[PDB]
Design an enzyme around this catalytic site. Structure first.
Site, PDB file in Angstrom:
ATOM      1  N   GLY D 165       0.785  -1.207   0.000  1.00  0.00           N
ATOM      2  CA  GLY D 165       0.000   0.000   0.000  1.00  0.00           C
ATOM      3  C   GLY D 165       0.826   1.270   0.000  1.00  0.00           C
ATOM      4  O   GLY D 165       1.948   1.290  -0.534  1.00  0.00           O
ATOM      5  N   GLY D 166       0.269   2.337   0.576  1.00  0.00           N
ATOM      6  CA  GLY D 166       0.983   3.589   0.599  1.00  0.00           C
ATOM      7  C   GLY D 166       2.418   3.335   1.024  1.00  0.00           C
ATOM      8  O   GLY D 166       3.369   3.919   0.469  1.00  0.00           O
ATOM      9  N   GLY D 400      24.570   9.266 -30.540  1.00  0.00           N
ATOM     10  CA  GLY D 400      23.900   9.725 -29.343  1.00  0.00           C
ATOM     11  C   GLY D 400      24.433   9.092 -28.080  1.00  0.00           C
ATOM     12  O   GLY D 400      24.833   9.788 -27.148  1.00  0.00           O
ATOM     13  N   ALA D 401      24.450   7.765 -28.033  1.00  0.00           N
ATOM     14  CA  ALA D 401      24.948   7.076 -26.848  1.00  0.00           C
ATOM     15  C   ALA D 401      26.324   7.626 -26.459  1.00  0.00           C
ATOM     16  O   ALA D 401      26.574   7.963 -25.293  1.00  0.00           O
ATOM     17  CB  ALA D 401      25.029   5.573 -27.102  1.00  0.00           C
TER      18      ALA D 401
END
Ligand SMILES: *C(=O)CCCC[C@@H]1SC[C@@H]2NC(=O)N[C@@H]21
Ligand SMILES: *C(=O)CCCC[C@@H]1SC[C@@H]2NC(=O)N[C@@H]21
Ligand SMILES: *C(=O)CCCC[C@@H]1SC[C@@H]2NC(=O)N[C@@H]21
Lengths: 170, 506, 506, 506
Positions: D165-166, D400-401
């Protein structure tokens, strides 16, 4: 606000204000309305107004809910409050002055420079009674409330400490 | 949901219409009615209206009123944001619980994050006993906040009912404490314990009533005639104050002239030096529309402290009163002004100091009471102060006191003097007896030696030669002189050495 | 030139050998001999030795002694730089002139630019009357400096002769004031003026002698037996102090163990709650080599303030003394601890607070005296303090006082408790009478109602459930607990909101 | 009081000896036993041991255990202060309440005020339902704290039981998440709700088990074999980390030489470009005593993130793995390294980036998955980072890399290259087809055009002529080059433009 309640000589005046540039138009309950015109501005101790075309000269002073106004022999606190202010102020207790002893006690341990009152003399509320010299500084003691001198027990040159009864009043 | 409208209206009732009457009977307004008169008509927003306490001891949980004893929130005073809390005496006596404090802390924390004053309306019977240490902790969180916000955002305390025990310590730390003439009071220990322990029997009003505090204890700054004027006068105060320590004093229109001359002044200092005069006359004639909001009027009357505006800006004023104790400086007068100075400084409010002090007040009472420490406080205040400081000596300025009253040595900006000023080590007489010992057995030597000291030193000119008095001015022109003097100081910026904090004598 | 050596020797003679004898006659050492015992053997460098005054009035220029009345300079204490000035009473009575002050200012200005304490040895007749306002100004520059360095570099004041008038105000603003048992005194106004104005007759020793001040006025921090120990003890003090507000308390070797256990402690709190015990026992056993340098021992005895070291580091300590006024807090005890706390905090010295307070001291005397304000001071102090704060409640912790004594609500770091601790809103008795009204006419109900409050609330466990006491510890281990607690806080760093300065009550 | 000892020992029992066995039954240690192995033998100081919850609903007030489900306090790891909390599953399931969180906040607030890491040992069934919104608020104060401390003091989360949960959101925001192989798990929504809403049937272990999270979700940083190694490895981790963002990486002795040569390295890059090699070999040989604490090993395996030391100081390392996806950069590899880089920078840990990336991983799955945003994260991380950045390209550095991998355009300090490096716009093939269109119909032109691009651009020298590679080195000397490169950057100081915070893609 536009709605106010002016409280004068024990009389309440629920009033409404509408003003533009020239002056202001105050309207009362009964449907009647006066036109106030003025030069006045905060701080001016004297106010020259023109209410309903007729000159009204007042002496102004600040007070918590408005001012102290003085016209003819008149001199009265004029409270200018808002309806809820007014409403509540009405729940405020009525202030009763303090009690006064008929015995003038000396509040400063000094020397009595002069007494300007005789036994059996009648004094006005706030009248100069005697004058004690503090630390090369003169202090004028005065009647608390209007009364008549019962007895005196100190004179020029005398040197009294605090509380020493200077005079007595009947 | 009109159900909401119901819950709302229900809460607004407090401890009930019967208790509301009870309250009104004491000439006391309700928590909510006080908030109503304090804030700009319809500008109040309330927070935590349905908050309930979390106590389970002593069947406390069977009485879970809404609001839990205090009304908190914000609103404005003349359009400026202000945070507030009014204790509701009709609800569990406005007793302090964990949750009551929490509510006060929320708006304090909010006042600080947004830089706006906090007005505290205390009217509480005291701690909520059933909460045990939770009541104490509740006080703690308020206290801490009071402390962190000191000199950061104005904190004005309004006591309009009872304030007893730990509680008193909160208002204690706020910047002002106003009380309502007869319906209010405060003390750390109650009258009944004072009896069981001191065998002294005294009434609450005698022990810590408005008067006792406005003129004996040094705790309150004023005692208002009743709830209505009290609330009116507080807004009046708020109108002078800056919203926090970042912005400078507020500005507003002013129908007066910075070049106003008061010829009357030219004769205010009596010819005979043993004759007083009321220093307040000066204040009023200097003050803008003649308006002077005095602080601690009825206490340490030998000194005056208050607020005025010049060219529509707030200026604090500290001045000696010849009418009382001959303008002497004493423990109490010192404590009174010293704090005033520091508050004005912490908040960028300039100072105008009007001088006429002979020296400090002599006495075993004073020495045993610690004037060495207390007296110093006012000195410390001016030393430390960095706002613009203007000074006008009207007559007497002798020795130590002379130095303390915003002297040029404390780095004041303008040190003006009236021709009638006399700045010197001490009076001609005593000065003579020290400088000329072997001459006393000749009452004409000393009678002449004094007559020379007097003629040569009792004046403002030796000080002028030195630079200690920037100038000697004609009394009538004081308003003009001072107004522009401050005008030129609006940009003043001075740095004190870095430090966590000061160590001023306590 | 041996001419230089002559001038030098010449100067060193002060008001000359006949006066030097006079001085010694009063059991008083000379300016120079005092300096000699203060600084590390031969480490004194003197400044302005041949300075002469610039007075021309009253034939003052015919007497231009070298040094003009004060010895200033620097040196070290245990190898650490310290700035000093010793007033030479044999020279124009060590009277304060423009040039005497200037000399003091030079070393104050130097102490600040280099971050070193300033030891002031006052032994002066007072102001140099012939200098007129120049004597006043002289004081001014000292004051201003005194003020600017407050909480920036330590200022220890030593009074070893007379200190009269404006002068008192300087030491007043320094961080400590020690006096020499019988040869020293200080007061704003002289005994003779006290006569001509109060008609009261009193001797200087009565008015402001060492005893009067270390015990009645709250002005001095201790009265030393004589000039020699006075000086020895001052160095002792300095050894604890940090040189300025930037560095943290000094460190040095320590022949003691941080894990030392004192089983004796386990029975220190007496079984009967009406029986005191000496809080100082605890202090000593906790203190490092048992060394405890007490401050203001003979004043506000219902509270103890001193210095100790732990693992060889300085730790300031505030503790309640059951032996006096039953560990009550009162105006004086409050003012006494309050300042101690602030100084220690302004200078990064941690705080250890040993608690056993019942509440505040009841009384018309207290309320009329302003406890609301003075009481607050200590509260304010802890609220403001950001150094590491460790607390150990040994027994009583009731109400408002509980909160004031470095409670967890003031953001102290470690809130330890002895099993014998009792933290609550008030005593079981009073608590009961408030919580159970309709039950008094039944002396068995209230006898039982109290017996329960006692059994359920007078202890440290309700506060434990809440988290307000980080832990309940075995008395014997305190030294161990506290030592490491501080150890882990050496890196503490907490920020108070920005502000020019605080507005603490005065 | 031996009564204290009893209470103490009572508390130590948690949910009781029967539940303790249950716990041990699942191979899980107890809250206290975990704390016991985490902190330096006997160095744990516990806080809030007797804290009890304040719930009153659902008869919750009849079950008020001591400690209320979590063990908090501090201690040391190898002598360095660390703050900790271990959830006690045997007590009300170690369910989070108002008070359970408060305890955690106390030490989080303490960790921050003193600059020390916070180790969280989560083993909880989730929120304490009976508390209602108070459980929610409980989480809230932890979260807030978790957030404020992000990058200010290291926050290591240890999951050793359930986390649902939270709750998950707290460890989510800490700097590290470690899980214990089979006894732990975590997920926002439970398996049973996953059914009733997805009709999907899955077991807790499948849904959010150590494995699922260490290699599928990207949530955990490692799954330890059991509670004991879990704890041991965490201290190991802590020994590398700085205590807070002010100090720099800790230092310690190191029995290795900064000038060590690994000739083996000279042949690590295989001749054939289609044959991988294990980037990790390099890492170990460069690493100090060959020690390499890996983070998220079992996730995004195409990239490696870990810690090593050099000359006994901590160095973070990001390097491409040929063995997986051919060292491609992809959404997950990006997210994985991006955060590692940011944490290392936020805490002054230098970076060593070892490069051999071909480009990004092609695919509809990638583009629709947002590589545009995720891919940028790592770029963003290196662009933002200002710690010292040393890089060594072992082989492939295309397009790019190439830029993203701590290129010189991201202002890295040293950009080293092995002679086998090849930095270029794209491969020789593709490059050629774009540069030479009208030449494809001549399979010998393009066969030759490629052979030229290959011979002229696939290397590190064109990049060297440009200054992009500070130097090309002999593989064997890498350890030597890199060690002193960092040594020389110990003083590096670089400033990023002022801003409240960044806006990196999410
Ligand atoms: C005349 O009556 C004797 C002189 C009184 C001394 C005065 S009282 C206050 C002034 N300050 C001071 O210390 N002494 C001065
Ligand atoms: C016996 O209990 C008589 C009552 C005394 C009360 C004590 S005296 C000092 C403590 N503080 C306080 O206000 N009351 C406590
Ligand atoms: C050879 O089989 C064709 C070339 C495949 C391209 C490879 S796949 C991953 C690398 N990055 C990229 O965009 N292209 C490279």
């Amino acid at each position: 606000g536009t709605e106010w309640v002016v409280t004068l000589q024990g009389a309440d005046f629920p009033v409404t204000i509408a003003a533009d540039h020239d002056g202001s138009t105050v309207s009362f309950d009964d449907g009647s309305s006066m036109r106030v015109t003025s030069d006045w501005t905060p701080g001016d101790q004297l106010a020259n107004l023109m209410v309903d075309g007729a000159p009204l000269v007042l002496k102004v002073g600040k007070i918590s809910g408005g001012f102290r106004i003085r016209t003819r022999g008149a001199d009265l606190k004029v409270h200018v409050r808002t309806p809820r202010q007014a409403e509540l102020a009405r729940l405020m207790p009525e202030k009763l002055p303090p009690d006064t002893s008929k015995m003038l006690l000396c509040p400063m341990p000094g020397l009595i420079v002069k007494v300007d009152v005789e036994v059996g003399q009648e004094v006005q509320e706030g009248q100069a009674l005697c004058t004690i010299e503090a630390m090369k500084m003169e202090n004028i003691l005065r009647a608390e409330k209007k009364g008549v001198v019962a007895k005196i027990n100190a004179s020029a040159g005398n040197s009294l400490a605090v509380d020493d009864v200077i005079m007595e009043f009947e | 949901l009109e159900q909401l409208e119901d819950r709302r209206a229900a809460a607004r009732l407090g401890g009930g219409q019967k208790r509301i009457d009870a309250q009104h009977g004491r000439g006391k307004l309700t928590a909510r009615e006080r908030v109503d008169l304090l804030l700009d008509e319809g500008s109040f927003e309330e927070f935590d209206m349905f908050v309930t306490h979390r106590c389970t001891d002593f069947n406390m949980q069977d009485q879970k009123p809404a609001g839990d004893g205090v009304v908190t929130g914000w609103g404005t005073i003349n359009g400026r944001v202000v945070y507030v809390f009014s204790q509701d005496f009709t609800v569990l006596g406005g007793s302090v619980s964990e949750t009551h404090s929490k509510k006060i802390c929320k708006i304090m924390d909010m006042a600080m994050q947004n830089g706006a004053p906090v007005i505290g309306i205390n009217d509480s019977g005291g701690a909520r006993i059933q909460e045990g240490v939770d009541s104490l902790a509740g006080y703690g969180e308020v206290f801490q906040r009071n402390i962190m916000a000191s000199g950061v955002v104005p904190q004005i305390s309004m006591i309009m009912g009872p304030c007893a025990g730990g509680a008193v310590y909160s208002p204690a730390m706020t910047d002002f404490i106003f009380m309502v003439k007869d319906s209010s009071y405060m003390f750390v220990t109650g009258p009944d314990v004072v009896k069981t322990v001191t065998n002294e029997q005294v009434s609450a009003e005698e022990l810590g009533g408005a008067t006792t505090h406005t003129r004996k204890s040094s705790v309150a700054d004023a005692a208002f005639e009743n709830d209505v004027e009290a609330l009116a006068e507080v807004r009046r105060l708020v109108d002078f104050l800056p919203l926090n320590n970042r912005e400078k004093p507020p500005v507003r229109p002013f129908f007066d002239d910075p070049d106003r001359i008061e010829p009357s002044l030219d004769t205010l200092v009596p010819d005979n030096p043993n004759t007083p005069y009321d220093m307040k006359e000066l204040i009023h004639k200097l003050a803008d529309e003649g308006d002077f909001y005095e602080i601690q009027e009825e206490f340490a009357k030998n000194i005056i402290t208050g607020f005025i505006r010049l060219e529509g800006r707030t200026v604090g004023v500290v001045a000696n009163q010849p009418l009382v104790l001959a303008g002497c400086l004493d423990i109490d007068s010192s404590r009174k002004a010293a704090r005033f100075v520091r508050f004005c400084d912490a908040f960028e409010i300039p100072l105008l100091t009007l001088i006429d002090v002979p020296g400090f007040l002599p006495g075993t009472s004073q020495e045993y009471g610690g004037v060495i420490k207390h007296g110093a406080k006012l000195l410390y205040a001016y030393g430390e102060a960095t706002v613009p400081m203007v000074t006008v000596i009207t007559r007497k300025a002798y020795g130590g006191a002379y130095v303390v009253m915003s002297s040029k040595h404390l780095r004041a900006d303008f040190n003006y003097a009236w021709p009638t000023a006399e700045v010197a080590v001490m009076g001609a007489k005593g000065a003579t007896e020290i400088i000329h010992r072997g001459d006393l057995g000749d009452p004409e030597k000393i009678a002449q030696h004094t007559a020379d000291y007097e003629e040569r030193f009792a004046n403002p000119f030796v000080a002028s030669e030195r630079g200690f008095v920037d100038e000697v001015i004609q009394p009538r022109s004081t308003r003009k002189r001072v107004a522009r003097a401050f005008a030129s100081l609006r940009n003043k910026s001075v740095q004190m050495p870095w430090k966590k904090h000061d160590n001023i004598p306590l």
